[PDB]
Amino acid sequence: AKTQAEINKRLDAYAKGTVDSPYRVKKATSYDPSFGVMEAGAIDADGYYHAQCQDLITDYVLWLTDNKVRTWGNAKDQIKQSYGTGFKIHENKPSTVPKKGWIAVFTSGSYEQWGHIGIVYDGGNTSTFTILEQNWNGYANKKPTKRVDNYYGLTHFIEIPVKA
Ligand code: MMC
Ligand code: MMC
Ligand SMILES: [Ca+2]
Ligand SMILES: [Cl-]
Ligand SMILES: [Hg+2]
Ligand SMILES: [Hg+2]
């Protein structure tokens, strides 16, 4: 498990393009004509579809679990598997405020077909929070980027283990 300080450091490094990850693009990379050239800092964990939302989580979960757990499936499929001990899936109830480093999973509305996923950067309040995510633009080309979300379509949070 990682400490909150380690988690918080890693989130800023994702957003800065400096994260210690072997899946971070070092030089602008392209292989899929349907997507934009991945900029330095984009995370591509599977070698398909350039830098999608789930690529970020694959990397993050690998890091949290010392490379023991590789995610499978699309964003929406993350709530149908377990990343292991100390990971907990919570339904988003309208009371529910997430914590920094938790994983936010969108599975309804326009997000239904593949889902969307990202990391809670600031837990916010009941109205909004700040997410760190890839590919909210659809072009699969940008590094992880922060966005204010209003909980629309957001159905679950994955609580991650945090070391004292
Ligand atoms: C490798 Hg944590
Ligand atoms: C609330 Hg699990
Ligand atoms: Ca990818
Ligand atoms: Cl997405
Ligand atoms: Hg640990
Ligand atoms: Hg939607």
Residue numbers in the entry: 2 to 165
Task: Provide text from the study.
LysK, an endolysin from staphylococcal phage K, contains an N-terminal cysteine-histidine dependent amido-hydrolase/peptidase domain (CHAPK), a central amidase domain and a C-terminal SH3b cell wall-binding domain. CHAPK cleaves bacterial peptidoglycan between the tetra-peptide stem and the penta-glycine bridge. The structure has the papain-type fold with a long loop between the two amino-terminal alpha-helices. The structure suggests the location of the active site near a hydrophobic groove, with Cys54, His117 and Glu134 forming the catalytic triad.
For the derivative structure, a calcium ion and a 2-[4-(2-hydroxyethyl)piperazin-1-yl] ethanesulfonic acid (HEPES) molecule have been modelled associated with each of the protein chains, while Cys54 is modelled as methylmercury-cysteine. In this case, ordered solvent molecules modelled in the unit cell include two glycerol molecules, ten additional putative methylmercury ions, two putative chloride ions and 770 waters. In the derivative protein structure, the calcium is present at the same occupancy and with the same coordinating ligands. In contrast to the tightly bound calcium ion, the zinc ions appear to be bound more loosely and the derivative structure shows they could be replaced by methylmercury ions upon soaking of the crystals with methylmercury chloride. A zinc ion was also found and is likely more loosely bound, as it is less buried, has less protein ligands and could be exchanged for a methylmercury ion upon derivatization. In both structures, a buffer molecule occupies the groove that likely accommodates the peptidoglycan substrate: a Bis-Tris molecule (2-[Bis(2-hydroxyethyl)amino]-2-(hydroxymethyl)-1,3-propanediol) in between the two monomers of the asymmetric unit of CHAPGH15 and a MES and HEPES molecule in the case of the native and derivative structures of CHAPK, respectively.
